[PDB]
């Protein structure tokens, strides 16, 4: 059927943001002309899914600049928060089976691209709805931060590519199960 797919860059220690929600590691590194370009990844997906953290980020980092007008966007949140009515954005809570249906149904036989973060992602994985990844691992280690994929127990999973930039970064994707 269709991907949920977790694309993300994480560090060498497996962390998506320092522990003060930053990504200077990641923003101030140069991956290289040799890297999969991010247009045709992004051709691949019909939806996004995130979580409220890196929903806020977003908004407080690029407020008039959403990346994701191109597609519907489903945000997750315990919150009644609100987007600018303007945008393609839902949210949603609870059980993420029926977040993943909704999605993948939006994404109209694209790919569904969990942006993140590590909590929501787990979410999705501790609920065997979380099928594929495509990490970009920055060379640096910082040591402590966000996780990038909290699991309650060991997911493991098939790798089915990997590529070594020229910049030192890295190129993987995962197949769950
Ligand atoms: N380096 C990269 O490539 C990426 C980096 N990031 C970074 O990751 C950081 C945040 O990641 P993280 O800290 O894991 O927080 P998340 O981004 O995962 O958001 C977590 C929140 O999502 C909500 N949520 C999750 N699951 C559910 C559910 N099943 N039902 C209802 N609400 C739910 C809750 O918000 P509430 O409290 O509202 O209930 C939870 O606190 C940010 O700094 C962001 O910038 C993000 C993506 C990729
Ligand atoms: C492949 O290597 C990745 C590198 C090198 C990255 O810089 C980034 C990522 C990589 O995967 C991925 C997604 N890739 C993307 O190209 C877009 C930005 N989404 N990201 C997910 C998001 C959403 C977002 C949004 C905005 C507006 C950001 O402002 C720039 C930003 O930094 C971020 C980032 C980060 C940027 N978090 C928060």
Same mark, same amino acid.
Request: glycine fraction near 8%; aromatic fraction near 10%.
């Given at each position: *059927? /269709? ?6 860059? =994480?560090? !060498? +220690? ?61 945000? *997750? /949140? ?6 600018? =009515?303007? !945008? +393609? ?89």
């Amino acid at each position: *059927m /269709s991907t949920l797919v977790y694309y993300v860059a =994480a560090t !060498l +220690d497996g962390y998506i943001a320092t522990q003060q929600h930053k990504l200077d590691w990641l923003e101030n590194f140069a991956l290289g002309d040799d890297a999969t370009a991010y247009d045709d990844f992004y051709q691949t997906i019909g939806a996004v899914v995130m979580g409220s953290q890196t929903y806020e980020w977003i908004m407080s980092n690029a407020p008039d600049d959403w990346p994701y007008q191109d597609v519907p966007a489903f945000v *997750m /949140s315990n919150r009644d928060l609100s987007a600018p =009515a303007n !945008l +393609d954005i839902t949210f949603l809570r609870g059980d993420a089976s029926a977040i993943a249906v909704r999605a993948r149904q939006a994404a109209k036989g694209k790919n569904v691209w969990l942006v993140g973060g590590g909590k929501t992602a787990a979410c999705f994985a501790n609920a065997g709805e979380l099928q594929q990844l495509f990490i970009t691992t920055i060379p640096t280690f910082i040591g402590t931060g966000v996780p990038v994929l909290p699991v309650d127990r060991a997911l493991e999973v098939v790798l089915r590519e990997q590529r070594t930039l020229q910049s030192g970064a890295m190129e993987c994707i995962l197949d769950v199960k």
